[PDB]
Nucleic acid binder design. Structure first.
Lengths: 175, 175
DNA sequence: CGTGATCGGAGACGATCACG
DNA sequence: CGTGATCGGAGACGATCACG
């Protein structure tokens, strides 16, 4: 279902403290630090068909356990599909049902992933096509030339966009 | 069932003219030239539990079609198991049932195969163990050193046995 | 010593829908 | 442009018996 951006912010603010995964029986929570609102929500659209968040896992081994054992404090939800990298929830928010998408990225790959998951799709098609015609492949995980990772001395998404050879835009003016 | 060597010779002499395979619907016969009596029959034992023959296929592509489409002129038989390299028959010979084993070898590999299929097993265990302790592997198909075929300028089984570093013995005095 | 034929069961693999 | 999750179906692969 669709929801306003204001409802979206309220929903996200609720979840920031109430997400967790169980690791061999014990329940570890995800810190707000490692939760990033993305998708149409970060683009600040008036209407949203889903709520997308991206969770930063600080260790590669934990990808096994985070999304497939995701838990939400006191909130009814069903699982649509779920793997190690993408998890789609149907959440119940005040007697209504909204689609909630979760995704995972490790620390090394955080800037590349934030750029991918905020979009929009048309914006990235044009960016990756431009880099495709210089023999580059760019994905959520990194930038590649000859099946090899290109080491960019970067940290933020903003430094990445400029290092790829385009001007940084606030997310809400990417089209 | 078991049969005398004299019955064995009579059985083999019958088959030499009456074996054939169908190749995409047409029935091609195997020439006596390319049929070699092996096993305990070649060792000339008094009693045999089977009749083993080895058929030389003059082209690698025909391995698909020879044994799996084997035909015997006017003789009742059932198939026990059958592949491209080994075929085991239950033949009916004068109101009795005898096991008939067929095997295939290409021209390149004829001497190595004749040495394998006449045996006996104890004789080859000792020969191949001796070559194993000089980093050689010998099989029905060739002699190998470092996963590579060893090119022996040989033709007959007798030249092979001497080139491997052992004296030739008539088949009936191999133990 | 070294390989073959057969059985049966798993795991990449293409097709499909989905994610930004 | 580039990848993910899921379904379902095939083909090497180990175990077993067999071949000299």
């Amino acid at each position: 279902g669709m929801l306003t951006l204001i409802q979206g912010k309220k929903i996200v603010n609720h979840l920031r403290s109430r997400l967790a995964f169980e690791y061999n029986g014990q329940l570890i929570k995800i810190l707000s630090k490692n939760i990033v609102a993305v998708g149409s929500l970060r683009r600040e659209e008036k209407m949203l068909n889903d709520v997308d968040l991206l969770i930063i896992v600080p260790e590669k081994k934990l990808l096994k356990h985070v999304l497939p054992n995701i838990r939400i404090k006191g909130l009814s939800f069903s699982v649509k599909v779920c793997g190690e990298r993408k998890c789609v929830l149907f959440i119940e928010w005040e007697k209504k049902t909204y689609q909630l998408d979760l995704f995972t990225a490790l620390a090394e790959e955080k800037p590349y992933a934030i750029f991918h998951f905020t979009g929009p799709v048309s914006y990235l098609i044009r960016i990756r096509a431009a880099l495709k015609k210089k023999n580059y492949k760019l994905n959520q995980y990194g930038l590649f030339k000859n099946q090899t990772l290109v080491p960019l001395k970067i940290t933020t998404e903003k430094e990445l966009i400029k290092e790829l050879g385009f001007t940084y835009r606030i997310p809400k003016k990417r089209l």
